[PDB]
Amino acid sequence: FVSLDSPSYVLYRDRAEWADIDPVPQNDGPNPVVQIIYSDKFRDVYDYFRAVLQRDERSERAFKLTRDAIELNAANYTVWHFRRVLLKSLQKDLHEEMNYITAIIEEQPKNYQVWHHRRVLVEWLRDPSQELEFIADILNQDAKNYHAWQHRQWVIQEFKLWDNELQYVDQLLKEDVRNNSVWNQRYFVISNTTGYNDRAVLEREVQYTLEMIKLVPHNESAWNYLKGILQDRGLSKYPNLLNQLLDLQPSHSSPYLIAFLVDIYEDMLENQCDNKEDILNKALELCEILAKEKDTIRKEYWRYIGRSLQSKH
């Protein structure tokens, strides 16, 4: 009806249709701590919300009242909950509410309550038709919004919408190959569809990642994805990978490559490799280089790895 900043907005204590109900002021105790000096509009709304909640009034006026409480503070989870309680009682049109929550999330996408309210609506309607597009728009404003990606994984999983997600991943990686949220989605999609056990899928993934590394050698995400898709089997189980990384050595060296080499040696030693002394020595040299020169911020970690390698092999 009338927005909180609308020129004809009227305080609740002045609305005739609300005169029958007494407002419930918030009791902070005689000596208030962390006491917020609320604006008159804010307090006014919350004094009435407190009253309807207390009376558990499932009315249409209470329902509209929650919209104002939400504009005043969209993080008030109690208001959102009571609102969901009203959507059910009043049997409100959920597609209407979907439009509302779509608007809300657009203004403030970094909020836990709003994304949850949307999820509840989608579950109630068992209708996911709008999700991937809406999320894609939010992600279009912040390609890394955590809640956006989380809600997205949920809808895809719950409603089996796997079909186009890998193309989506590829498009976003094209836009920003450093977007870690996208590399994460890539893992999510693949492990939940074809899996990585299919050697053809694994090779495709390893080739793709290596290409990305060669284009942007210092992009950490690609390096992390590469170790991520190979670590479960063991890095020493892919003998060609060592040689290929060593080739990149001069022309593409970086703390990431050197670190990856240590990981490989780590696993090799762990797996009864030949030349244990040689590999141990190569690995220890790298730990020293990373600790003293190439990755000094992680000196303590690299020194620790060096000591581990020595106590084990």
Add this chain to the structure above:
Amino acid sequence: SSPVWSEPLYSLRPEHARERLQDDSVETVTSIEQAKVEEKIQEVFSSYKFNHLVPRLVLQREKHFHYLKRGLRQLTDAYECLDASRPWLCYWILHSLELLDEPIPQIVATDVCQFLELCQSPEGGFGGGPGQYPHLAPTYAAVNALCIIGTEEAYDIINREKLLQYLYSLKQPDGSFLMHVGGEVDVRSAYCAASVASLTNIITPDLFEGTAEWIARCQNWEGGIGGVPGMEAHGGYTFCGLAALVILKRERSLNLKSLLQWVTSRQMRFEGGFQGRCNKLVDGCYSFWQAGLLPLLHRALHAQGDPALSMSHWMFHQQALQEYILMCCQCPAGGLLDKPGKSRDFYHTCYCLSGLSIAQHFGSGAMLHDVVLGVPENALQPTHPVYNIGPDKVIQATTYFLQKPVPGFE
């Protein structure tokens, strides 16, 4: 050595310039944002250097104290957005004063106690303000505040029988917990439940059945832990996950090796502070969420007899983190912040100081080793890595409640 009025800084070493981002001539929003932050940070680092003269860093205690003291009583309507987070304001402020070793006047202590009583729901748990529904986050905050206070008056405000029933009412069959009735589910709830439950002695055999396994499912390919299974590794969720598992004595459920490599990589080579997830920006609050994982991993590894563990350092750059916090996260007017150019706030004041304290103090067994960068007065009170309230407060609180029975059980 060098004169006492001059202390060489890691961030100011000439080699440090080599730690600037290398975008490989391929710009994306990510490299661009990172470069802007680094650019600003460089200017800040430079302002503390006067050729060979490098004055000791100083933690503006008084300025922070006045800021905290002022906020514990009243706040502007700019704080209307935190109307459902009041017990957090109490916890952020009290823990900060606690780290700074500023005492809490008993009048204020009692007033805070009374307020949290008003936030406590009749069904158990604490709401974000008087009359609001219980929610695990403010419940966690309130219990910690009460523990920081340490008086029996504080301890007793907690209605334990209802607190246990409440936790039960949020327990899901798969091991997770709702943040509140009809609320979202993510790893924060597991930590909140495990924290309050252990501190107040209300853990039953079934309460956390399946929780450890659910949390492990949150550990992803990166090594960190995401909010829910499948989601991106994030320091906030990783802290919650590991700390929870430590409380449950189930750290071994995680691949500690990949967790360690992940968290150590989250420390920014140039800034010295920590980022929340790979390829995102540095932020002072991660000084606690990320760096706090190291004391936890240390304890976990030491527990399983790791012979290579250090006996004097956490596996992160303690100096660099302190440099970042002291040089880039202090507001001239008091309070601490995310990064240069951000407004101060109580949340960051709390976490920047918590991280500073962890970066300053190492301990394992009877092994102690401090690294207080700057003037000696910079040294803060130690903080417990699992609960993030003083270690003394933890023992005292758990001792008190251990003298009570678990609500309606055995």
